[PDB]
mmCIF file of C-alpha atoms and ligand atoms in Angstrom:
data_model
loop_
_atom_site.group_PDB
_atom_site.id
_atom_site.type_symbol
_atom_site.label_atom_id
_atom_site.label_comp_id
_atom_site.label_asym_id
_atom_site.label_seq_id
_atom_site.Cartn_x
_atom_site.Cartn_y
_atom_site.Cartn_z
ATOM 1 C CA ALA A 1 -178.272 85.948 2.837
ATOM 2 C CA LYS A 2 -174.902 86.206 4.273
ATOM 3 C CA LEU A 3 -171.793 86.632 2.163
ATOM 4 C CA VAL A 4 -169.101 85.833 4.703
ATOM 5 C CA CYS A 5 -165.646 86.647 3.013
ATOM 6 C CA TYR A 6 -161.605 85.654 4.442
ATOM 7 C CA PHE A 7 -159.020 88.230 4.612
ATOM 8 C CA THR A 8 -155.539 86.734 4.699
ATOM 9 C CA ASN A 9 -152.600 88.462 6.997
ATOM 10 C CA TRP A 10 -149.873 87.066 4.785
ATOM 11 C CA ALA A 11 -151.218 88.046 1.334
ATOM 12 C CA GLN A 12 -149.574 91.351 2.130
ATOM 13 C CA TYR A 13 -146.065 89.455 1.128
ATOM 14 C CA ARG A 14 -147.034 88.304 -2.586
ATOM 15 C CA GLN A 15 -145.087 89.815 -5.041
ATOM 16 C CA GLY A 16 -146.368 92.666 -7.846
ATOM 17 C CA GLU A 17 -149.847 93.010 -8.389
ATOM 18 C CA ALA A 18 -150.714 89.961 -6.185
ATOM 19 C CA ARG A 19 -149.645 91.872 -2.722
ATOM 20 C CA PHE A 20 -153.167 92.187 -0.798
ATOM 21 C CA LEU A 21 -153.647 94.794 2.064
ATOM 22 C CA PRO A 22 -156.733 95.951 3.534
ATOM 23 C CA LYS A 23 -156.951 98.917 0.798
ATOM 24 C CA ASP A 24 -157.745 96.299 -1.437
ATOM 25 C CA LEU A 25 -160.765 95.084 -0.117
ATOM 26 C CA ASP A 26 -164.157 96.554 -1.142
ATOM 27 C CA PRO A 27 -166.246 97.456 1.903
ATOM 28 C CA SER A 28 -169.613 96.558 0.365
ATOM 29 C CA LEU A 29 -168.330 93.548 -1.231
ATOM 30 C CA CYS A 30 -169.582 91.292 1.528
ATOM 31 C CA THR A 31 -171.674 91.265 4.569
ATOM 32 C CA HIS A 32 -169.118 89.495 7.002
ATOM 33 C CA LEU A 33 -165.294 90.186 6.926
ATOM 34 C CA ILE A 34 -163.207 87.665 8.867
ATOM 35 C CA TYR A 35 -159.548 88.325 9.495
ATOM 36 C CA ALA A 36 -157.256 85.151 8.994
ATOM 37 C CA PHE A 37 -155.595 84.376 11.721
ATOM 38 C CA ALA A 38 -154.954 85.158 15.184
ATOM 39 C CA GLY A 39 -152.788 82.885 17.124
ATOM 40 C CA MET A 40 -152.387 81.826 20.921
ATOM 41 C CA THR A 41 -149.728 82.513 23.611
ATOM 42 C CA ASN A 42 -150.322 81.072 27.116
ATOM 43 C CA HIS A 43 -154.007 80.228 26.128
ATOM 44 C CA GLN A 44 -154.639 83.996 25.138
ATOM 45 C CA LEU A 45 -155.889 85.488 21.778
ATOM 46 C CA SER A 46 -152.631 86.845 20.300
ATOM 47 C CA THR A 47 -151.280 88.782 16.833
ATOM 48 C CA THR A 48 -149.345 86.403 14.308
ATOM 49 C CA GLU A 49 -147.770 89.641 12.013
ATOM 50 C CA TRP A 50 -145.874 92.363 13.478
ATOM 51 C CA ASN A 51 -148.241 94.771 11.575
ATOM 52 C CA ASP A 52 -151.489 93.092 12.907
ATOM 53 C CA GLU A 53 -152.685 95.746 15.263
ATOM 54 C CA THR A 54 -152.206 98.412 12.452
ATOM 55 C CA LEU A 55 -154.292 95.927 9.885
ATOM 56 C CA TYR A 56 -156.911 95.136 12.509
ATOM 57 C CA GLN A 57 -157.667 99.236 12.706
ATOM 58 C CA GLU A 58 -157.796 99.545 8.897
ATOM 59 C CA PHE A 59 -159.996 96.264 8.622
ATOM 60 C CA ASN A 60 -162.507 97.451 11.410
ATOM 61 C CA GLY A 61 -162.155 100.821 9.950
ATOM 62 C CA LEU A 62 -164.136 99.796 6.919
ATOM 63 C CA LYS A 63 -167.093 99.846 8.746
ATOM 64 C CA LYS A 64 -166.978 103.624 8.600
ATOM 65 C CA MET A 65 -167.841 103.331 4.603
ATOM 66 C CA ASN A 66 -170.254 100.388 5.359
ATOM 67 C CA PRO A 67 -171.960 100.687 8.740
ATOM 68 C CA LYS A 68 -173.618 97.281 8.144
ATOM 69 C CA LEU A 69 -170.665 95.453 7.792
ATOM 70 C CA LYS A 70 -169.613 93.150 10.779
ATOM 71 C CA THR A 71 -166.200 92.076 11.412
ATOM 72 C CA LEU A 72 -164.893 88.734 12.973
ATOM 73 C CA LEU A 73 -161.018 87.365 13.910
ATOM 74 C CA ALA A 74 -160.159 83.744 12.983
ATOM 75 C CA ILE A 75 -158.020 82.014 15.358
ATOM 76 C CA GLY A 76 -156.286 78.778 14.377
ATOM 77 C CA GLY A 77 -155.635 77.596 10.798
ATOM 78 C CA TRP A 78 -153.443 74.721 9.204
ATOM 79 C CA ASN A 79 -150.094 76.344 10.525
ATOM 80 C CA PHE A 80 -150.873 76.013 14.070
ATOM 81 C CA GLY A 81 -149.115 74.654 17.181
ATOM 82 C CA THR A 82 -150.098 71.239 17.790
ATOM 83 C CA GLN A 83 -151.040 71.428 21.256
ATOM 84 C CA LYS A 84 -152.336 74.733 21.778
ATOM 85 C CA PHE A 85 -156.346 74.333 21.406
ATOM 86 C CA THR A 86 -156.245 70.780 23.397
ATOM 87 C CA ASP A 87 -154.436 72.426 26.552
ATOM 88 C CA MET A 88 -156.551 75.443 26.398
ATOM 89 C CA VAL A 89 -159.599 73.271 26.457
ATOM 90 C CA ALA A 90 -158.648 70.838 28.944
ATOM 91 C CA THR A 91 -159.517 72.891 32.028
ATOM 92 C CA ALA A 92 -162.206 75.181 32.810
ATOM 93 C CA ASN A 93 -159.335 77.790 33.973
ATOM 94 C CA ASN A 94 -157.526 77.826 30.863
ATOM 95 C CA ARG A 95 -161.064 78.177 28.923
ATOM 96 C CA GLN A 96 -162.071 80.819 31.064
ATOM 97 C CA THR A 97 -158.499 82.560 30.383
ATOM 98 C CA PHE A 98 -159.131 82.431 26.865
ATOM 99 C CA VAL A 99 -162.937 83.804 27.153
ATOM 100 C CA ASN A 100 -161.815 86.778 28.943
ATOM 101 C CA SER A 101 -158.943 87.555 26.576
ATOM 102 C CA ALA A 102 -161.069 87.215 23.828
ATOM 103 C CA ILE A 103 -163.621 89.475 25.022
ATOM 104 C CA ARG A 104 -160.824 92.483 25.931
ATOM 105 C CA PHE A 105 -158.882 91.727 22.619
ATOM 106 C CA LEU A 106 -162.004 91.989 20.395
ATOM 107 C CA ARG A 107 -163.211 94.795 21.988
ATOM 108 C CA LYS A 108 -159.525 96.599 21.949
ATOM 109 C CA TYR A 109 -159.701 96.494 18.570
ATOM 110 C CA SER A 110 -163.022 97.094 17.326
ATOM 111 C CA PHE A 111 -164.159 93.484 16.015
ATOM 112 C CA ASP A 112 -167.618 92.331 15.956
ATOM 113 C CA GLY A 113 -166.815 88.442 17.030
ATOM 114 C CA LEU A 114 -164.503 85.383 16.724
ATOM 115 C CA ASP A 115 -164.230 82.874 14.418
ATOM 116 C CA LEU A 116 -162.975 79.364 15.590
ATOM 117 C CA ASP A 117 -160.744 77.429 12.878
ATOM 118 C CA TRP A 118 -159.081 74.607 14.978
ATOM 119 C CA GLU A 119 -157.997 71.912 12.482
ATOM 120 C CA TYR A 120 -159.146 69.918 13.919
ATOM 121 C CA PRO A 121 -160.646 68.688 17.539
ATOM 122 C CA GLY A 122 -160.389 64.784 17.645
ATOM 123 C CA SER A 123 -158.195 64.171 14.485
ATOM 124 C CA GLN A 124 -154.761 64.923 13.719
ATOM 125 C CA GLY A 125 -153.396 64.323 17.319
ATOM 126 C CA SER A 126 -156.062 65.754 19.046
ATOM 127 C CA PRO A 127 -157.393 63.205 21.643
ATOM 128 C CA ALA A 128 -161.343 61.797 21.413
ATOM 129 C CA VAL A 129 -161.941 63.716 24.293
ATOM 130 C CA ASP A 130 -161.515 66.952 22.466
ATOM 131 C CA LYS A 131 -164.576 66.270 20.701
ATOM 132 C CA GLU A 132 -166.690 67.032 24.164
ATOM 133 C CA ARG A 133 -164.292 69.774 25.115
ATOM 134 C CA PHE A 134 -165.035 71.797 21.931
ATOM 135 C CA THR A 135 -168.377 71.921 22.544
ATOM 136 C CA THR A 136 -168.023 73.135 26.119
ATOM 137 C CA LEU A 137 -165.430 75.786 24.809
ATOM 138 C CA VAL A 138 -168.393 76.797 22.475
ATOM 139 C CA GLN A 139 -170.790 77.076 25.353
ATOM 140 C CA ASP A 140 -168.366 79.059 27.296
ATOM 141 C CA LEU A 141 -167.768 81.340 24.649
ATOM 142 C CA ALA A 142 -171.477 82.056 24.116
ATOM 143 C CA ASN A 143 -172.332 82.351 27.732
ATOM 144 C CA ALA A 144 -169.743 84.924 28.384
ATOM 145 C CA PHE A 145 -170.283 87.231 25.154
ATOM 146 C CA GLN A 146 -174.047 86.995 26.358
ATOM 147 C CA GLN A 147 -172.965 88.533 29.635
ATOM 148 C CA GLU A 148 -170.708 90.845 28.359
ATOM 149 C CA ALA A 149 -173.122 92.730 26.057
ATOM 150 C CA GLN A 150 -175.186 93.414 28.945
ATOM 151 C CA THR A 151 -172.561 94.715 31.217
ATOM 152 C CA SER A 152 -170.928 97.048 28.482
ATOM 153 C CA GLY A 153 -174.161 98.025 26.431
ATOM 154 C CA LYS A 154 -172.336 97.219 23.289
ATOM 155 C CA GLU A 155 -173.978 94.651 20.446
ATOM 156 C CA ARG A 156 -173.216 91.382 21.607
ATOM 157 C CA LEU A 157 -170.179 89.707 20.032
ATOM 158 C CA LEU A 158 -170.313 87.190 17.318
ATOM 159 C CA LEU A 159 -169.325 83.396 17.623
ATOM 160 C CA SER A 160 -168.962 81.250 14.270
ATOM 161 C CA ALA A 161 -166.807 78.004 13.317
ATOM 162 C CA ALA A 162 -164.856 77.184 10.373
ATOM 163 C CA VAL A 163 -165.794 73.101 9.906
ATOM 164 C CA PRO A 164 -164.418 70.275 7.725
ATOM 165 C CA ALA A 165 -166.317 68.757 5.061
ATOM 166 C CA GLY A 166 -164.626 65.367 5.524
ATOM 167 C CA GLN A 167 -166.939 62.504 7.182
ATOM 168 C CA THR A 168 -164.279 61.080 9.436
ATOM 169 C CA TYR A 169 -163.186 64.717 10.774
ATOM 170 C CA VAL A 170 -166.703 65.412 11.287
ATOM 171 C CA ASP A 171 -167.576 62.319 13.211
ATOM 172 C CA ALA A 172 -164.405 62.567 15.466
ATOM 173 C CA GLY A 173 -164.568 66.090 16.299
ATOM 174 C CA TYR A 174 -168.083 67.699 16.654
ATOM 175 C CA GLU A 175 -171.330 67.385 18.572
ATOM 176 C CA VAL A 176 -173.213 69.112 15.737
ATOM 177 C CA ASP A 177 -176.637 69.558 17.123
ATOM 178 C CA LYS A 178 -174.871 70.786 20.510
ATOM 179 C CA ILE A 179 -172.543 73.326 18.875
ATOM 180 C CA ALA A 180 -175.029 74.547 16.229
ATOM 181 C CA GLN A 181 -177.211 76.014 18.888
ATOM 182 C CA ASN A 182 -174.471 78.432 20.391
ATOM 183 C CA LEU A 183 -172.849 79.293 17.317
ATOM 184 C CA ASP A 184 -174.332 82.166 15.306
ATOM 185 C CA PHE A 185 -173.169 80.724 11.993
ATOM 186 C CA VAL A 186 -171.250 77.426 10.529
ATOM 187 C CA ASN A 187 -168.686 78.064 8.032
ATOM 188 C CA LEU A 188 -168.642 74.737 6.176
ATOM 189 C CA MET A 189 -165.048 74.300 4.488
ATOM 190 C CA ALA A 190 -166.611 72.663 1.233
ATOM 191 C CA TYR A 191 -163.235 72.413 -0.387
ATOM 192 C CA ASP A 192 -160.247 70.461 -0.625
ATOM 193 C CA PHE A 193 -161.490 67.370 -1.628
ATOM 194 C CA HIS A 194 -158.842 66.079 -3.565
ATOM 195 C CA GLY A 195 -155.449 67.113 -3.894
ATOM 196 C CA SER A 196 -152.051 66.034 -4.839
ATOM 197 C CA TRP A 197 -151.831 63.369 -1.857
ATOM 198 C CA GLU A 198 -153.953 61.390 -4.109
ATOM 199 C CA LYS A 199 -152.454 59.246 -7.193
ATOM 200 C CA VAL A 200 -155.131 60.527 -9.608
ATOM 201 C CA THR A 201 -156.821 64.141 -10.355
ATOM 202 C CA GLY A 202 -159.968 64.954 -8.811
ATOM 203 C CA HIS A 203 -161.416 68.299 -8.446
ATOM 204 C CA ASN A 204 -160.817 70.685 -5.394
ATOM 205 C CA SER A 205 -164.518 71.527 -4.830
ATOM 206 C CA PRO A 206 -167.235 69.291 -7.090
ATOM 207 C CA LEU A 207 -170.927 69.441 -6.152
ATOM 208 C CA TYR A 208 -171.916 66.012 -6.619
ATOM 209 C CA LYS A 209 -170.136 62.668 -6.761
ATOM 210 C CA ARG A 210 -169.243 61.225 -10.314
ATOM 211 C CA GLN A 211 -170.910 58.208 -11.683
ATOM 212 C CA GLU A 212 -167.978 55.913 -11.499
ATOM 213 C CA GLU A 213 -167.543 56.779 -7.462
ATOM 214 C CA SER A 214 -168.898 54.795 -4.723
ATOM 215 C CA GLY A 215 -168.112 53.878 -1.394
ATOM 216 C CA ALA A 216 -166.473 56.896 0.852
ATOM 217 C CA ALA A 217 -165.300 58.051 -2.668
ATOM 218 C CA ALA A 218 -169.159 59.089 -3.054
ATOM 219 C CA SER A 219 -168.937 61.661 -0.001
ATOM 220 C CA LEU A 220 -165.838 63.793 -1.592
ATOM 221 C CA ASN A 221 -168.308 66.594 -2.597
ATOM 222 C CA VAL A 222 -170.307 69.458 -1.574
ATOM 223 C CA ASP A 223 -173.761 68.008 -1.440
ATOM 224 C CA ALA A 224 -172.609 65.104 0.626
ATOM 225 C CA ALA A 225 -170.983 67.752 3.289
ATOM 226 C CA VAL A 226 -174.093 69.642 3.114
ATOM 227 C CA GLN A 227 -176.312 66.800 3.507
ATOM 228 C CA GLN A 228 -174.120 65.452 6.518
ATOM 229 C CA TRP A 229 -174.149 69.017 8.408
ATOM 230 C CA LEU A 230 -177.763 69.447 8.131
ATOM 231 C CA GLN A 231 -178.680 65.959 9.002
ATOM 232 C CA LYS A 232 -176.878 65.821 12.088
ATOM 233 C CA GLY A 233 -178.729 69.091 13.219
ATOM 234 C CA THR A 234 -177.248 72.344 11.907
ATOM 235 C CA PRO A 235 -180.481 74.601 11.012
ATOM 236 C CA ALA A 236 -180.319 75.115 7.465
ATOM 237 C CA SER A 237 -180.080 78.971 8.158
ATOM 238 C CA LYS A 238 -177.022 78.731 10.314
ATOM 239 C CA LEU A 239 -175.020 76.377 7.526
ATOM 240 C CA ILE A 240 -173.000 78.801 5.265
ATOM 241 C CA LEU A 241 -171.695 77.036 2.132
ATOM 242 C CA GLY A 242 -167.703 77.563 1.794
ATOM 243 C CA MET A 243 -166.814 78.481 -1.998
ATOM 244 C CA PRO A 244 -162.962 78.267 -3.295
ATOM 245 C CA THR A 245 -161.473 80.952 -5.013
ATOM 246 C CA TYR A 246 -158.557 78.764 -5.719
ATOM 247 C CA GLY A 247 -158.093 75.330 -7.389
ATOM 248 C CA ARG A 248 -155.911 72.508 -6.725
ATOM 249 C CA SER A 249 -153.541 71.199 -9.719
ATOM 250 C CA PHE A 250 -151.583 68.329 -10.352
ATOM 251 C CA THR A 251 -148.931 67.090 -12.361
ATOM 252 C CA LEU A 252 -149.897 64.124 -14.771
ATOM 253 C CA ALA A 253 -148.204 61.134 -15.741
ATOM 254 C CA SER A 254 -148.757 61.523 -19.039
ATOM 255 C CA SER A 255 -150.165 64.593 -21.332
ATOM 256 C CA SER A 256 -152.249 62.405 -23.486
ATOM 257 C CA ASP A 257 -154.211 61.346 -20.540
ATOM 258 C CA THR A 258 -156.197 64.346 -19.233
ATOM 259 C CA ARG A 259 -159.455 63.032 -17.832
ATOM 260 C CA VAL A 260 -160.390 63.300 -14.347
ATOM 261 C CA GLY A 261 -159.198 60.342 -12.330
ATOM 262 C CA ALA A 262 -156.295 60.053 -14.947
ATOM 263 C CA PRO A 263 -152.739 59.295 -12.905
ATOM 264 C CA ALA A 264 -150.970 61.582 -11.662
ATOM 265 C CA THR A 265 -147.470 62.138 -10.404
ATOM 266 C CA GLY A 266 -147.223 64.614 -7.674
ATOM 267 C CA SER A 267 -148.523 68.321 -7.192
ATOM 268 C CA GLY A 268 -148.857 70.913 -10.210
ATOM 269 C CA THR A 269 -145.939 73.494 -10.696
ATOM 270 C CA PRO A 270 -146.225 76.144 -8.133
ATOM 271 C CA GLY A 271 -148.010 79.481 -9.230
ATOM 272 C CA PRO A 272 -145.965 82.379 -10.137
ATOM 273 C CA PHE A 273 -147.432 84.451 -7.099
ATOM 274 C CA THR A 274 -148.721 81.678 -4.461
ATOM 275 C CA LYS A 275 -145.630 79.967 -5.072
ATOM 276 C CA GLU A 276 -147.059 76.905 -3.233
ATOM 277 C CA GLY A 277 -147.188 73.616 -5.487
ATOM 278 C CA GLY A 278 -150.846 71.870 -5.739
ATOM 279 C CA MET A 279 -152.423 75.020 -5.370
ATOM 280 C CA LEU A 280 -153.230 78.203 -7.668
ATOM 281 C CA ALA A 281 -155.343 81.343 -7.307
ATOM 282 C CA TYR A 282 -158.334 81.944 -9.507
ATOM 283 C CA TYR A 283 -156.172 84.836 -10.967
ATOM 284 C CA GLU A 284 -153.147 82.007 -11.624
ATOM 285 C CA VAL A 285 -155.407 80.036 -13.682
ATOM 286 C CA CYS A 286 -158.097 82.226 -15.325
ATOM 287 C CA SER A 287 -155.695 83.585 -17.730
ATOM 288 C CA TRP A 288 -153.949 80.427 -19.329
ATOM 289 C CA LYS A 289 -152.661 80.398 -22.923
ATOM 290 C CA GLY A 290 -152.768 77.752 -24.939
ATOM 291 C CA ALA A 291 -154.632 75.200 -22.543
ATOM 292 C CA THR A 292 -157.784 73.264 -22.741
ATOM 293 C CA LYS A 293 -161.025 73.801 -20.148
ATOM 294 C CA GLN A 294 -163.572 71.299 -19.855
ATOM 295 C CA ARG A 295 -166.412 70.845 -17.319
ATOM 296 C CA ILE A 296 -167.142 67.708 -15.205
ATOM 297 C CA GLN A 297 -170.675 66.758 -16.639
ATOM 298 C CA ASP A 298 -171.877 65.059 -13.155
ATOM 299 C CA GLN A 299 -170.085 67.327 -10.895
ATOM 300 C CA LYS A 300 -170.839 70.634 -12.172
ATOM 301 C CA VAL A 301 -167.273 72.233 -12.016
ATOM 302 C CA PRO A 302 -164.410 72.920 -14.265
ATOM 303 C CA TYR A 303 -160.884 71.858 -15.100
ATOM 304 C CA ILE A 304 -158.391 73.314 -17.065
ATOM 305 C CA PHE A 305 -154.733 71.427 -18.566
ATOM 306 C CA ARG A 306 -152.006 72.182 -20.908
ATOM 307 C CA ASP A 307 -149.196 69.810 -21.310
ATOM 308 C CA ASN A 308 -148.553 67.885 -18.276
ATOM 309 C CA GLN A 309 -150.375 70.201 -15.923
ATOM 310 C CA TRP A 310 -154.135 69.777 -14.665
ATOM 311 C CA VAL A 311 -156.313 71.903 -12.563
ATOM 312 C CA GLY A 312 -159.510 71.541 -10.811
ATOM 313 C CA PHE A 313 -161.003 74.983 -10.257
ATOM 314 C CA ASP A 314 -164.278 77.100 -9.887
ATOM 315 C CA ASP A 315 -165.271 79.716 -12.298
ATOM 316 C CA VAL A 316 -168.414 82.419 -12.410
ATOM 317 C CA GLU A 317 -170.609 79.739 -13.721
ATOM 318 C CA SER A 318 -169.925 77.007 -11.069
ATOM 319 C CA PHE A 319 -170.448 79.554 -8.565
ATOM 320 C CA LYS A 320 -173.388 80.335 -9.952
ATOM 321 C CA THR A 321 -174.557 76.937 -9.667
ATOM 322 C CA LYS A 322 -173.759 76.467 -6.071
ATOM 323 C CA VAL A 323 -175.710 79.435 -5.010
ATOM 324 C CA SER A 324 -178.791 78.316 -6.656
ATOM 325 C CA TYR A 325 -177.880 74.747 -4.910
ATOM 326 C CA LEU A 326 -177.361 76.524 -1.558
ATOM 327 C CA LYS A 327 -180.833 78.653 -2.078
ATOM 328 C CA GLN A 328 -182.733 75.391 -2.875
ATOM 329 C CA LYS A 329 -181.525 74.061 0.335
ATOM 330 C CA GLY A 330 -182.434 77.141 2.406
ATOM 331 C CA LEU A 331 -179.069 77.940 3.378
ATOM 332 C CA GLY A 332 -177.953 80.888 5.226
ATOM 333 C CA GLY A 333 -175.504 81.976 2.539
ATOM 334 C CA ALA A 334 -172.429 81.631 1.268
ATOM 335 C CA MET A 335 -168.506 82.028 2.589
ATOM 336 C CA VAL A 336 -165.268 82.350 0.700
ATOM 337 C CA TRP A 337 -161.838 81.341 0.810
ATOM 338 C CA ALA A 338 -160.176 84.168 -0.026
ATOM 339 C CA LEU A 339 -160.169 87.639 -0.834
ATOM 340 C CA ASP A 340 -156.864 87.646 -2.028
ATOM 341 C CA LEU A 341 -157.334 84.644 -4.342
ATOM 342 C CA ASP A 342 -160.044 86.170 -6.556
ATOM 343 C CA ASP A 343 -158.863 88.856 -9.199
ATOM 344 C CA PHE A 344 -159.231 91.431 -6.674
ATOM 345 C CA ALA A 345 -158.286 94.344 -8.910
ATOM 346 C CA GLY A 346 -158.940 93.154 -12.385
ATOM 347 C CA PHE A 347 -155.071 92.957 -12.980
ATOM 348 C CA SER A 348 -155.582 88.974 -14.627
ATOM 349 C CA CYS A 349 -158.862 87.850 -15.556
ATOM 350 C CA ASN A 350 -160.375 90.776 -17.829
ATOM 351 C CA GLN A 351 -163.380 89.980 -15.987
ATOM 352 C CA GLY A 352 -163.527 93.479 -13.732
ATOM 353 C CA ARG A 353 -163.048 93.401 -10.064
ATOM 354 C CA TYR A 354 -163.796 90.741 -7.747
ATOM 355 C CA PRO A 355 -165.225 88.592 -11.060
ATOM 356 C CA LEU A 356 -165.884 85.228 -8.492
ATOM 357 C CA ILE A 357 -166.966 87.073 -5.325
ATOM 358 C CA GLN A 358 -168.714 89.877 -6.925
ATOM 359 C CA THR A 359 -171.118 86.972 -8.762
ATOM 360 C CA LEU A 360 -171.845 85.584 -5.179
ATOM 361 C CA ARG A 361 -172.818 89.098 -4.145
ATOM 362 C CA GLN A 362 -175.357 89.554 -6.934
ATOM 363 C CA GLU A 363 -176.695 86.062 -6.953
ATOM 364 C CA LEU A 364 -177.493 86.150 -3.097
ATOM 365 C CA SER A 365 -179.483 89.202 -3.699
HETATM 366 C C1 LIG B 1 -153.596 72.532 3.480
HETATM 367 C C2 LIG B 1 -154.617 73.300 2.573
HETATM 368 C C3 LIG B 1 -155.526 73.872 3.162
HETATM 369 N N1 LIG B 1 -156.616 74.800 2.611
HETATM 370 C C4 LIG B 1 -157.308 75.702 3.360
HETATM 371 C C5 LIG B 1 -158.608 76.093 2.672
HETATM 372 C C6 LIG B 1 -159.464 77.245 3.549
HETATM 373 N N2 LIG B 1 -159.498 76.821 5.031
HETATM 374 C C7 LIG B 1 -160.019 77.401 5.890
HETATM 375 N N3 LIG B 1 -161.627 78.092 5.416
HETATM 376 C C8 LIG B 1 -161.915 78.677 6.469
HETATM 377 N N4 LIG B 1 -163.222 79.190 6.570
HETATM 378 N N5 LIG B 1 -161.116 78.540 7.641
HETATM 379 N N6 LIG B 1 -159.777 77.758 6.965
HETATM 380 C C9 LIG B 1 -158.290 76.038 5.635
HETATM 381 C C10 LIG B 1 -157.674 75.276 4.496
HETATM 382 C C11 LIG B 1 -156.010 75.291 1.219
HETATM 383 C C12 LIG B 1 -154.905 76.755 1.766
HETATM 384 C C13 LIG B 1 -154.878 77.020 0.213
HETATM 385 C C14 LIG B 1 -153.222 77.493 0.408
HETATM 386 C C15 LIG B 1 -152.661 78.062 -1.158
HETATM 387 C C16 LIG B 1 -153.363 78.530 -2.011
HETATM 388 CL CL1 LIG B 1 -153.149 79.600 -3.205
HETATM 389 C C17 LIG B 1 -155.082 78.515 -1.911
HETATM 390 C C18 LIG B 1 -155.165 77.903 -0.755
HETATM 391 C C19 LIG B 1 -155.256 74.248 0.935
HETATM 392 O O1 LIG B 1 -154.164 73.783 1.424
HETATM 393 NA NA1 LIG B 2 -161.871 68.045 5.219
#
């Protein structure tokens, strides 16, 4: 089984005990570490933070303590120039520029592969034709990585992609059966299913639907997303189930209505460390005093509320349930966003180091 864990190069700016650098990573925790995020300059892979060259060398240096570990660099994310992927995939020449730059850049810094995090071909400004051009990009990368291994004599570079759970993004952007052949594994982003863009509370990452949900709402859950990716042709062994070490928060319209589906007036108050309305790290929720925690019976995940604040998040028990689920489906392992949002140094939750991600490591064993 794989345990694919994401590092973020902006967690180094979090205050106090929440600051996260490569020295905070446990080299033995995961099987694959993915560095988020690289950028793109004139169709070439490029750094995004002043110290990326130094952090890359500390990150890949962790393979000295765990030689089984593989590392990848993720390109893209949710803050990204709106035309960069589209212009790069638009021509064979620009795809060649990108592929050749990726090989040189990954080898220079000792990464073992590339993770594609385009949000998203065919949606959010990206034209309909990018669905097919994304397939060509994936083919071009796979072909060039195969050839480079033979010329260089190194291990062939790995290729993965982070893919959406939402049905309309999947249909608009991905020739699932074609790309799954050329990708070594597929990181399913099984989270962000509900959020403060909605006028009622809902869980970030529920496993199943609620009885009351039907139509399109009945597909806003992990099981529906996994079934769509499998039914469209992803081999089960290549599908890696994403897990969130964060939750999504709401301000309730009234403190007396706290149910799932209760009216909400906007995002929950920003957390003290992550400072972003609507989201909270696990270490910001796990500790709340004077709160009430409940489980959503049909969806197998918890929420917690206090006064007019309501947060859907994942705990040790829901991570255990989701690993049981992925094993029942024969999936290739679990993926986690993100290392720096778990209680990575045992400073908040009274559950030791990495309580959520260590649960995955043990249950996948
Ligand atoms: C706009 C969304 C974006 N969303 C990302 C989740 C990981 N996603 C992904 N996973 C892989 N494998 N690649 N990219 C990409 C989307 C969350 C990012 C987040 C922000 C703050 C805090 Cl505290 C927790 C989380 C919530 O806000
Ligand atoms: Na989605």
